[PDB]
Symmetry: D3
Subunit: 231 residues, 6 copies
């Protein structure tokens, strides 16, 4: 159960890192754990559970089925406060900044700060930024998705987030998007900032993930085709 940040600050000296996103609602716990091991077949180095906002008995029951089989870390990815569980190794403690509603920026984050202090999860500080088009996290959290031809707005939100201590950033275009976050935006946020750069959504081609990672994305989030593309 060694620390996930030092784990990333140990991969990045040499290669780029990929993590597999799975939703506790889109299959049984077990069928997810065979999706889990089919991802280190390709060679992914972590699993991202959380998907959306869902009942938190399955979420634990799929983090339990994930805990035992696996030892690449499994990181929570809270669609809401129902996205916390004993079994995961690390939570992404994130604020979606380009939201229009304080609850998504700080509210949900304050209501759920006894649970992450009662339990023993690694809270990683993260700015979360929805790029156009946005996907379901687009309208779910009332976000204004940063346009594709406006990279320097994303950078402004990076620096803002870096100054407030969020050592990690996320450029989500949305799970299941036509194309990834545009490539200049990636390089540019990376230019102005020294956080771990996490790009996700709309990411399918082996070259989709070559270009996202090539554009400076420190982490690709979505196999063998793609982990070979990010190398």
């Amino acid at each position: 159960k060694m620390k996930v940040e030092d784990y990333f600050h140990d991969i990045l000296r040499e290669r780029k890192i990929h993590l597999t996103l799975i939703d506790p609602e889109e299959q049984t716990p077990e069928e997810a754990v065979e999706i889990a091991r089919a991802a280190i077949r390709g060679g992914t180095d972590g699993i991202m559970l959380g998907g959306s906002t869902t009942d938190s008995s399955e979420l634990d029951n799929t983090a339990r089925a994930l805990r035992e089989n696996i030892d690449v870390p499994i990181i929570l990815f809270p669609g809401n406060t129902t996205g916390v569980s004993r079994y995961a190794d690390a939570i992404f403690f994130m604020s979606l900044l380009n939201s229009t509603n304080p609850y998504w920026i700080i509210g949900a984050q304050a209501l759920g700060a006894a649970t992450v202090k009662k339990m023993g999860i690694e809270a990683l500080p993260m700015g979360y930024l929805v790029v156009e088009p946005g996907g379901t996290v687009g309208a779910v959290g009332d976000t204004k998705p940063v346009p594709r031809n406006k990279p320097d707005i994303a950078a402004a939100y990076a620096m803002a987030a870096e100054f407030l201590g969020m050592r990690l950033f996320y450029l989500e275009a949305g799970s299941g998007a036509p194309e990834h976050v545009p490539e200049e935006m990636i390089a540019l946020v990376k230019r102005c900032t020294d956080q771990i750069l996490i790009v996700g959504g709309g990411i399918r081609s082996g070259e989709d993930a070559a270009r996202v990672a090539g554009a400076g994305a420190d982490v690709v989030v979505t196999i063998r085709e793609i982990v070979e593309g990010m190398g």
Copy 2:
């Protein structure tokens, strides 16, 4: 002064607490204000804070040059708005108003000034910022839900989330002119739930005010209005 202020803080919390003096630049002229500032560095202040302003800043930029010519102690920006960025600031409280009703005071204004402050070598101290009843003018300017005094758990929730987002500093503001300062049973709770340097300001006038507010667990204390400062450093004794 010529070094990271955050590192300067800890070299003080080794043996005591910390006191900082708010000088709103607009309520005086620059070389009038150094005369206040050094008056402060004699009663026992450990920094000058440059804020309380949503107004002019050419004015405020001159203010900063005055103190850097004339002091050896940190002067720190307190940004009431993107106006509030100079270059002779040794540092800035890059803060977020957690209990604001409008995101501009949680992230928006920070996103806008983010470009400006990276340009300068202005040390960026990450600080969650939270206002309590009744809030002074803050409890109405930056549209806010000021946290009730008898609901401390709400200040801890905010402080703890703030601590998980990476904001290593945290500031209770009862408000410019409140009759009583921040409740002591609330200062002591957020000091326990997080590991942040806890700041507390507003309402402290008497010597015994800064006493019970530096005594209830606050690491640093903030004052405004002779050499009355040692009568406010006496109390963090």
Copy 3:
């Protein structure tokens, strides 16, 4: 029986009392013993939830109480967290004087399919915070109805009634020094047909008399 069909059934006693239990304020067990203490005279049903945050605590407490008691377990969500396999029924409620649409339709939009996934009896409820409010005051971006404006509370109540919200809930806050005024309870009751629920600041028998005597169909403590 059906839990709402049970409430209406009290066409005589006309005093549904419900006990509000917090999972995290204790353990899953003496909650049962306090539940049993509570069913031991003078209660008709068990509300659960209140405190937000953790869901682990919820499920054990719901699981432990379904077996040991004979009265309904009603979930009271402080957020989309308070949902469980082992409850009889849910107050499916909009926080009506919220300034923030998340608390009026957001969360409910976000949690509809988990109340779909169980079969849980979903009771449509209007949730109105009265001054002072409380924790749920600041937590839900309320605009707490002043005690001096019975008109305002009544207007929301007719509205929820007109949108199909069959149950109303004037909430004065856990910790309220004064329960809701009996003029606001009796106006809301004269204006709508909703099962009127009052809570917060009720700690005595004459406390629960004022609330009850004015109109309140259901009393919560």
Copy 4:
């Protein structure tokens, strides 16, 4: 003619699917509204809808006027605001604008007119009202956050949520005179997730426009 028009819709939804027509009292003399409506009873219209606009109500009362005293189909007023509440309508869609960013259109404005709606003997049909892309002008007037066209999952969730608050009808609004009507995938998904009476309107102009909508699940089609 008068009786509860919820029982009337249900009376028709066993044998067939019903149609309604949106009249704007502000585009026409109250007198014109009768021939414009009676001609639709000669057509396939099962009842008449009045509104789709916020304006002063001296005219909606003055068009409820003549429809009430001439035709034998229900007059359901379709409220552009608290303005639109006349005593001669046979019922009203008491709507929430579920995907509004502003509490005023979810609950605020309902709280202001609910006393005027109870004051009058008007049947009130509880209804969710969801704006889906492009939205037309209504999808900026309230400042809705229109549900995207390719995300019927969001629509269904609002529809379910809506159902669990006791809102028995659901309205999928494309927006008057929009280009393409509310997408078919978003219609069927709503109708299977809830027991609501589905109402669909906006940007349908053909008989084939109404064919595809009616054929994916919509109980009632609204046409301009």
Copy 5:
């Protein structure tokens, strides 16, 4: 049969202006006449019609009975966009400045404005600012001891060309808007300054008027008006 703003300025040259706020919700249109007729005998300069949000066919029948009996400006004081009528002589076209929600600042006026133009109705541009308690009226009411706050909105309002200003304690409030607040705003701006809600005495009316109010607005509460007008004069 003349311009209400000009009418406002004709009076303001040797006295202050009193207007009566009647309210078509709670009287037949004929009863409002007898009230309005009685405020006129008592010395009121204008009727203000509005103060709610409902059926507007009533707003019309009240404005028309009023228009063919009284000889005085009928003024609309709107609580939403339903508060318009062809029988008024003018409308307070107001922004609720310290609303928390844009609809009341500008959206409602965007929605309603095409109808103020469809009709010749004179529009007086008016900042509307709610001061605590604030009656029933998405407002963060200004505190009664934060007048520097109140005067900034007033100054704002002016620079945006809002010629009029309404310190609202909200009809029914226990105490009227403080004089330290009134007298701050009249020295800071050139607006016609209207103060309403909470004034029930000739005593109340005096202290408000002497603080600087140009207009005193009091509701339907019948010698009372004669008292209130006297209190001011």
Copy 6:
């Protein structure tokens, strides 16, 4: 520098339309802005708008040029004691009240203290909007734009600004500009997306009173409004 700008404006409009060169003073030190200015003024320009390197720029101009210096602020920084006048504007279709009335109220006391002429101006963003693009009016809903424009007139905003946003692909639709100009009697400013003489002329022929653009490439643009 001298005279009231609004009455300067009203006088050009008895003859022609008004073009204003917009200079962001954070984008160059003051020394070039006067060259950029005299350039603008070599082209048919009628005035300069900026929006402390801000306060330092306007300082110059006044002493070198004979057309007003107008302030075009976005935040609370955009006020300096050195301009002939200021666009005191309310971001109409903002979604946060700060850009409608708040930030005005916070900054109203600098504007009075500095005796600058203050122009009441509705300011309304258009699809796509640029970086300020807030809930921009769709490019095909000019009804919305008109409603806003008329509203701001009944509140006493005698000036009105449709902003496509700087660097926009195209300017504000002719169908919108014409409709706003026909609903209100206010000074109509249009800006963003005007790069060419033809840009300048479509916007100008559709009914705009002012045209905001930001070497002497102004001469094309001014030529255009002929």
